[PDB]
């Protein structure tokens, strides 16, 4: 597999506001981040992925995982946990209580679909990134 390899840049976020509300991000912070454009850098070698995300102020998040094996996950908030990612129909999926993330290439583009659950219900964010 090589489909995911390269450098990607956010071009659209659909469902951004409802998703952010559901997960408890306050209003002024939502507005402060609607036009933020994330750069994602991916190195894929078979089942091994290195997944790098560039944030403001030289802040970087790198994830490293093998499909189907328990891996160490890392977060922008500086948190850590363990998870297991499947590869199903070209789609990378992590799934657990209250949260699902899928990432695929559709129409030559990196498409990240997140689904979070809460007391308000469920919200979906679709983030699309173009190749740079
Ligand atoms: C608002 C802020 C941008 C700050 C700035 O531009 O100075 C951005 C940078 C990191 C962003 C977060 C990270 O990209 C991780 C999450 C990605 C989800 O798609 C939305 C919530 C999510 C939790 C984001 C909310 C918000 O847009 C953040 C916190
Ligand atoms: C849950 C967390 C959101 C925390 C945050 O940054 O705010 C996100 C940020 C980066 C995400 C990871 C990266 O997007 C790369 C992988 C993409 C796959 O679709 C799921 C597993 C995968 C390894 C993701 C799991 C999880 O959704 C992570 C770790
Ligand atoms: C949702 C995300 C957690 C995901 C991650 O760990 O990357 C975190 C990263 C920084 C967090 C924010 C910061 O901790 C600062 C604020 C702290 C307040 O207690 C809640 C709102 C508040 C504005 C947070 C909302 C949300 O939990 C944010 C945006
Ligand atoms: C923009 C917002 C506060 C709004 C304000 O300016 O008052 C701040 C509060 C908490 C901040 C976040 C937290 O400091 C956690 C992260 C710290 C990293 O150094 C940058 C991204 C990071 C995810 C931050 C992005 C952004 O600057 C947040 C979300
Ligand atoms: C597991 C970790 C805390 C672990 C630690 O103390 O290191 C926590 C802190 C921020 C949490 C995330 C934030 O609360 C934002 C999301 C909220 C959704 O309800 C579940 C997934 C969601 C993406 C969370 C997954 C997980 O519970 C995170 C990543």
CATH of the domain at 108: 2.40.128.20
Tokens, residue 65: 């995982």
Q: Looking at ligand 4, which residue's alpha carbon is closest to its atom 3? A: 29
What's the reported resolution, in angstroms, to a tenth? 2.2
Report how far apart, in Å, the C-alpha atoms of 26 and of each of 14, 19, 89, 117 are.
18, 11, 36, 17
| Phi and psi torsions of 29, nearest 5° | -75, -40
- The H or E element spanning position 65 is strand 59-66
Burial degree of 110 (CB within 10 A; 0-12, 13-18, 19+)? buried
Q: Looking at ligand 1, which residue's alpha carbon is closest to its atom 16? A: 76
| Distance (Å, whole) CA 64 – CA 69 | 11
Query: Measuring CA to CA, which residue among 78, 75, 55 is closest to residue 63?
Result: 75
Report how far apart, in Å, the C-alpha atoms of 100 and of each of 14, 43, 124 are.
16, 22, 9
Q: How far is the CA of 70 from the centre of ligand 1 (A)?
A: 26
Q: Looking at ligand 4, which residue's alpha carbon is closest to its atom 18? A: 59
Q: Is 54 annotated as a binding residue?
A: no
Query: How many separate domains does the chain show?
Result: 1
Tell me, using a 6 A CB cutoff, whether residue 32 lines ligand 4. yes
Query: Measuring CA to CA, which residue among 16, 26, 19, 15 is closest to residue 122?
Result: 19
Long-range contacts formed by 16-20: CB under 8 A, 24+ apart = 16/125, 18/123, 19/114, 19/116, 19/123, 19/124, 19/125
Report how far apart, in Å, the C-alpha atoms of 19 and of each of 84, 118, 126 are.
23, 10, 10
Q: How far is the CA of 119 from the centre of ligand 4 (A)?
A: 25
Provide the domain limits for residue 63.
1-132
| Distance from chain centroid for Cα 105 | 13
Q: How was this structure determined?
A: X-ray
Tokens, residue 49: 């992925």
């Amino acid at each position: 597999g090589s489909a995911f390899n390269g450098k990607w840049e956010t071009e659209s976020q659909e469902g951004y506001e409802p998703f952010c509300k559901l997960i408890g991000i306050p209003d002024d912070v939502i507005a402060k981040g609607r036009d933020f454009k994330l750069v994602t850098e991916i190195v894929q070698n078979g089942d091994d992925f290195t997944w790098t995300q560039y944030y403001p102020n030289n802040h970087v998040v790198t994830n490293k995982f093998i499909v189907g094996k328990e891996s160490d996950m890392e977060t922008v908030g500086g948190k850590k946990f363990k998870g297991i990612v499947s590869m199903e129909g070209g789609k990378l999926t992590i799934s657990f209580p209250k949260y699902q993330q899928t990432t695929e290439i559709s129409g030559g583009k990196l498409v990240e679909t997140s689904t979070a659950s809460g007391a308000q219900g469920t919200a979906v964010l679709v983030r699309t990134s173009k190749k740079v």
